[PDB]
Each structure stands twice: as C-alpha cells, then as structure tokens.
C-alpha cells in the first residue's frame, strides 16, 4: 500500500542562539526535507532537486509570501503568549506542526497542533470541528478560533489543499522518494573491565526504516541490545548503531543482522 506524508513544522524563538534565525519553517515529504524558510533569508528555498526542478517561479514567490506572513504572525504570538503567562523576557518558544497523510491516494489523517515552551497548547480535532485547549492559558485561543470559523478553514486546508499538493509532490519526486541506498555495515568490538562491547553500525541507508539485530548463535538475543535509534547523515541518508555486551572471548559467537529495503536478503555481519 502506498503511504505518503506532508508535514510542516514551524519554530519561533525568543532565544535561538548567536547567529541563529529566531523564526524557521521547514516542510517534509515522506520524512524528507524539501522546503525551507527562515527570518534571515526571508524566502522559501528548495531543499531537494526534484522540487527545484518541477516548480516554477510563481510557486516560490507565493510560498515566500506565506512564509513572511507566518513570520509576522508568530512574532505577535510570542508577545501575546508571554503577556498571557505573565512572563517578561528569558527564553520562550512557539512550535507549530500540521500536515496530512495519504494512503492509496486517500487522506487518512490531518493534524494542526501548537505547543508553547515545549508543552501541548492547542490541537485541532477535525472530527468534532473543535479546537482542544491543553492548558488553561489556551482556553481564550480555543474560543477565539472557533468564533472566527477556523475549524472550517483548517478542515478544508487539511482535507483538500494539503492533500492535493501532497499528491503533486509525490509525483514530482517519485523516482527520488522511491530510491534505495544500501548501507555499509561494520561490526566493531571494545573490551573494558571484563566486558566486551560489540557494536554494529549501518552507514548510509535509505529509506529510513531499518532493523538491526544481534543474533547469539542464531537466536535473536536482544537482551543487552542497546540501539541508538535512527539518526541522519548530511546527505539525505541515515545511520544506526546497536551494541550488545558480551563476555571476553565470546566475539565469534555473535552475529549482526541487517534488514533493509535495499537488501533482498538480510545482511549478516560479524567481528
């Protein structure tokens, strides 16, 4: 089944750090970064080759207008929220995430959520056409938005607009999104204090999902198994590492197994 996602996330900070823009928006198609805006450049730029190639100038112009408008709004939001919370300066952040998921072309979800200082603030519930106030300070926002018919507006963005563009993007980048990049795998060992820690590292795979298991003479022994999760490289591919603690001299006993879309049969690796 063909599953695709479109996701925008937006960050407005009072304290982004030296040299850093205080406002940033980025968009993802199937988890892959493809557009970017920040308050420094003040325009939307492509982050994949396929969006840069298939989109025209009017697309970027119009999107840049959206980005600038969002910046001005969140500039104001930061001020409104700090006063509502009785906070003067220091460090505060607004976060937005919203988007849609399609399966076989049909929408299966649409979300629009906000957080303040790292905590849920509001979430759109599309089913009941209501906004949820997660904290007392969000109650006037809920009341304001539902008063101005924001539910209908976000219902049509999420069910029509978001979905339409997602279907467009997936066709633009069909070859790229469906690409396969095979990991290079290395098993390494380090003994310290009567404990041999065996490491298995998968380098540069795409797509993101992967299963890396430690097999102890054939059986999926995930007891000592510590996974570092899946982490990104700078080049659009991913990385993961999984360790297992063993007894000294028990190294040729363990096998690393890597299951990934680029590998027709699972890879087996050892020290």
């Amino acid at each position: 089944m063909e599953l695709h996602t479109l996701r925008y996330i937006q960050t407005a900070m009072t304290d982004p750090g030296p040299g850093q823009p205080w406002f940033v928006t980025v968009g993802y198609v199937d988890g892959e970064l493809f557009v970017h805006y920040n308050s420094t450049a003040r325009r939307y730029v492509p982050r994949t080759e396929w969006i840069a190639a298939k989109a025209d100038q009017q697309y970027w112009d119009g999107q840049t207008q959206i980005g600038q408008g969002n910046e001005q709004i969140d500039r104001e939001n930061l001020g409104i929220l700090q006063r509502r919370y009785n906070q003067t300066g220091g460090s505060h952040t607004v976060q937005w995430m919203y988007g849609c998921d399609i399966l076989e072309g049909g929408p299966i979800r649409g979300y629009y959520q906000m957080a303040y200082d790292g905590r849920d603030f509001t979430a759109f519930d599309k089913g009941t056409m209501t906004f949820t106030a997660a904290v007392p300070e969000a109650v006037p926002t809920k009341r304001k938005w539902e008063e101005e018919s924001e539910p209908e507006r976000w219902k049509n963005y999420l069910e029509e607009t978001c979905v339409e563009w997602l279907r467009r993007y997936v066709e633009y980048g069909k070859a790229e999104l469906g690409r396969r990049e095979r990991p290079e795998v290395r098993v390494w060992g380090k003994e310290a204090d009567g404990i041999l820690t065996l490491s298995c590292r998968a380098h540069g795979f795409y797509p993101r999902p992967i299963v890396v298991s430690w097999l102890k003479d054939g059986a999926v022994r995930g007891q000592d198994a510590h996974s570092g999760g899946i982490v990104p490289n700078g080049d659009g591919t991913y990385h993961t590492w999984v360790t297992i603690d063993a007894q000294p001299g028990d190294g040729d006993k363990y096998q690393c197994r890597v299951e990934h879309a680029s590998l027709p049969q699972p890879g087996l690796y050892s020290w």
């Binding site: 925008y8 937006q10 928006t25 968009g27 557009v35 119009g62 999107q63 959206i66 980005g67 408008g69 969002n70 709004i73 969140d74 104001e76 939001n77 409104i80 929220l81 937005w96 919203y98 629009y112 906000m114 603030f121 509001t122 969000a138 926002t141 304001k144 938005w145 101005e148 924001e150 976000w154 963005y157 607009t161 978001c162 563009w165």
Partner: peptide
C-alpha cells in the same frame, strides 16, 4: 504548500 497559522 504551507498554510497560514493564526494569532493566538
């Protein structure tokens, strides 16, 4: 295409 968020 992104959306416009709204003032809180």
């Amino acid at each position: 295409l992104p959306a416009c968020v709204l003032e809180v």
